[PDB]
């Protein structure tokens, strides 16, 4: 029983080893939008007689 407790403690510290890290690479990314209409700014001014 004493040996079982000693072997258990040793195995516990052997299992305390890291494997990897996982994360997300999202900094710098932004969401795009869509503009449906071209913003022209033209008006036509004509005289009453059309001259």
Partner 1 sequence: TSGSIINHANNLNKVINHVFADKPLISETMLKILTIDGTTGKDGYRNWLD
Contact residues for partner 1, defined by CB under 8 A: 1-2, 5-6, 8-9, 12-13, 16
Report residue 35 as tokens. 């503009």
What's the min distance (Å) between Cβ of 35 and partner 1? 53
Provide the 8-state DSSP code for 37: S
Q: Tell me the H-state helices in the chain.
A: 2-14
Instruction: Pick between residue 1 and residue 31 the one whose CB is nearest to partner 1.
Output: 1
Instruction: Pick between residue 12 and residue 32 the one whose CB is nearest to partner 1.
Output: 12
Most distant CA atoms of the chain, gap in Å: 113
What's the min distance (Å) between Cβ of 16 and partner 1? 6
């Amino acid at each position: 029983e004493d040996m079982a407790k000693i072997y258990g403690a040793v195995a516990a510290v052997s299992k305390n080893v890291n494997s990897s890290v996982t994360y997300e690479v999202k900094r710098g990314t932004h969401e795009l939008i869509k503009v449906p209409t071209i913003p022209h700014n033209l008006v036509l001014i004509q005289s009453d007689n059309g001259k």
